[PDB]
Design an enzyme around this catalytic site. Structure first.
Site: not given
Ligand code: XIY
Ligand code: CL
Length: 274
Positions: A14-15, A96, A20, A17, A35, A135
């Site tokens: 999470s953040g 990631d 998710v 964005f 999401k 980004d």
């Protein structure tokens, strides 16, 4: 009806964005990412040919949807009273690039070359489809570990690509170019190339080159790890202070450091244990 269609698993992250979750499509057991983005937290809103109001992120994802595996695929989306829910493909296993570099440190140049090349192909695909990501960074790149294939995620800061000046920005400051820091003005492709220089430095050195505005503005690059002369040259080119002194995507991929790239499957076999 989202509830019967998907089986929700644990939170993946999470953040800025959103939130998710791991999920599974109930019909065929397909791995997906679910999401959620709050409407109140949505900066700008897009079109869609039929003319319903969706987040720009939905607009951008549908524009980059294709067979091409370099960008995350939007499978579906739902509107709720206070949020939008996005169904995205999920490679499994996946990690990631930020977590990958955190775990392994600075990447061998052969690995960085393969990863960076795939990022360039993904970003070229976006621009081709009229999409500017805005980004590009380690946290917004997923590694499909079995296949050695990278995917761009998190288009929530993106825009339709234009040739005129951008005077708005909400991506990550430490990947943002000096013309944004100094003037609040940038052009899409040359700002993307700057972030790509930051990213490449991050892969081969294991951390980003600049932390503060003054460092971004000064543009002096110090290598803290041993990096080849050709790689240093490419990085310093991408991180040219004047936007017009920066390489085109074509000049990057023709650069001597970029030659003889590994195939993704070769990359998995050699570097990802596959
Ligand atoms: O936006 C964060 C995000 N994490 C993901 C994991 C798998 C697939 C897509 C994902 N998107
Ligand atoms: Cl995403």
């Amino acid at each position: 009806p989202l509830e019967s269609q998907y089986q929700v698993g644990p939170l993946l992250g999470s953040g800025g964005f959103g939130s998710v979750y791991s999920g599974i499509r109930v019909s065929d057991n397909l791995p997906v990412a679910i999401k959620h983005v709050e409407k109140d937290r949505i900066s700008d809103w897009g079109e869609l040919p039929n003319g319903t109001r969706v987040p720009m992120e939905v607009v951008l994802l549908k524009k980059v949807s294709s067979g091409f595996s370099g960008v995350i695929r939007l499978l579906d989306w739902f509107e709720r009273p206070d949020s939008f829910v996005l169904i995205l493909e999920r490679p499994e296993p996946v990690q990631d690039l930020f977590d990958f570099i955190t775990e392994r440190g600075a990447l061998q140049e052969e690995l960085a070359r393969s990863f960076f090349w795939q990022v360039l192909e993904a970003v070229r695909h976006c621009h081709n489809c009229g999409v500017l990501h805005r980004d590009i960074k380690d946290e917004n790149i997923l590694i499909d570990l079995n296949r050695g294939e990278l995917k761009l995620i998190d288009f929530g800061s993106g825009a339709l690509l234009k040739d005129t000046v951008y005077t708005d920005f909400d991506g990550t400051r430490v990947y943002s170019p000096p013309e944004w820091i100094r003037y609040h003005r940038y052009h899409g492709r040359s700002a993307a190339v700057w972030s790509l220089g930051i990213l490449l430095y991050d892969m081969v050195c294991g951390d980003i080159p600049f932390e503060h505005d003054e460092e971004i503005i000064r543009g002096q690059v110090f290598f803290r790890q041993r990096v080849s002369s050709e790689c240093q040259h490419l990085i310093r080119w991408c991180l040219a202070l004047r936007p017009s002194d920066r390489p085109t995507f074509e000049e990057i991929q023709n650069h001597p450091w970029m030659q003889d790239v590994l195939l993704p499957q070769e990359t998995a076999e050699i570097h990802l244990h596959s």
